[PDB]
């Protein structure tokens, strides 16, 4: 565990993270995909051996000794708001279980079910609150990665609000 477990946000490519493991915003089929998933495939392609897993789950595959936690959030184009919310909360609970099991002191994590799984809705607050619900009982330093300047400010505000 970290001496003083924290949350931080950075606006940059999660493939360049400075943490002990990474969470991939994966598809259920273990395909290279697009966005974060494609960046993760280019950086850690070995971690996509037998990475397919159902929606609402996380599956860890090593790239050398570096753990890639493939977390599959729901695609809100396909799920109802209710069932999508339940699956999104579940994926983050499975990430917290894997982070704990691995014994890492830090993890790099994107906001699940934003971008192409958002069903065209702004889900910053929904996704980030599920992240906090799962990760608050863990003692890893959490570094959230985003690409948008306005999202950086909103995530930073939400972190600082609760300190
Ligand atoms: C930046 C981002 N904007 N969005 C977004 C998507 C739909 C509606 C509004 C906003 C993301 O998911 C990431
Ligand atoms: Cl970058
Ligand atoms: Cl997404
Ligand atoms: Cl973003």
Q: How far apart are CA 37 and CA 41, in angstroms?
A: 6
Q: How far apart are CA 54 and CA 159, in angstroms?
A: 30
Q: How far apart are CA 48 and CA 22, in angstroms?
A: 13
One-letter-per-residue 3-state SS of 92-136: HHHHHHHHHHHCCCEEEEECCCCHHHCCCCCCHHHHHHHHHHHHC
Residues spanned by the domain of 17: 1-163
Q: Is 153 in the pocket of ligand 1 (CB under 6 A)?
A: no
The candidate with the shortest Cα–Cα distance to 68, out of 88, 49, 89, is 49
- Ordered alpha helix ranges (H), the chain: 36-43, 81-102, 124-135, 149-161
The answer on whether 73 is annotated among ligand-binding residues is no
The candidate with the shortest Cα–Cα distance to 108, out of 40, 17, 5, is 17
Atom of ligand 1 nearest to the CA of 123: 12
- CA of residue 110 to ligand 1 center, whole Å: 13
Which region, left, alpha or beta, applies to residue 113 given φ > 0 means left and ψ of -120 to 50 means alpha? Answer: left
Q: How far apart are the first and last CA of the chain?
A: 19
Q: How far apart are CA 51 and CA 30, in angstroms?
A: 5
Backbone angles phi, psi at 10, to 5 degrees: -130, 145
Q: How far apart are CA 53 and CA 70, in angstroms?
A: 8
DSSP 140: S
Signed CA dihedral, 8, 159, 57, 1: sign only: positive
Place of tokens 């799920």: 79
Token representation of residue 35 = 């966005």
Token representation of residue 113 = 């079910």
User: 124, 126, 147, 154: which to mutate for ligand 1, most atoms within 8 A of CB?
Assistant: 124
Q: Residue count of the chain, please give it.
A: 163
For residue 7, how far is the Cα from the chain centroid?
Answer: 13
Residue 14, helix vs strand vs coil: helix
The candidate with the shortest Cα–Cα distance to 15, out of 31, 39, 38, 34, is 39
Token representation of residue 60 = 């860890």
Q: Per the structure, how many domains does the chain have?
A: 1
Q: Is 46 in the pocket of ligand 1 (CB under 6 A)?
A: no
137, 64, 45, 61: CA torsion to nearest 10: -40
Q: How far apart are CA 131 and CA 111, in angstroms?
A: 8
């Amino acid at each position: 565990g970290a001496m003083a477990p924290s949350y931080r946000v950075k606006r940059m490519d999660i493939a360049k993270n400075d943490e002990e493991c990474v969470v991939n915003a994966a598809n259920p089929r273990g395909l290279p995909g697009d966005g974060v998933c494609k960046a993760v495939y280019k950086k850690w392609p070995e971690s996509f051996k037998n990475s397919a897993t159902p929606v609402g789950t996380a599956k860890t595959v090593m790239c050398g000794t570096y753990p890639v936690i493939h977390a599959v959030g729901p695609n809100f184009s396909n799920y109802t708001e209710s069932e999508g919310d339940r699956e999104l909360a579940a994926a983050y609970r499975e990430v917290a279980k894997e982070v704990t099991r691995l014994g890492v002191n830090s993890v790099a994590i994107p906001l699940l079910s934003t971008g192409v799984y958002s069903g065209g809705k702004d889900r910053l607050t929904q996704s980030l609150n599920h992240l906090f619900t799962a990760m608050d009982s863990t003692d890893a330093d959490v570094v959230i990665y985003c690409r948008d300047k306005e999202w950086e400010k909103k995530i930073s505000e939400a972190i600082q609000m609760r300190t």
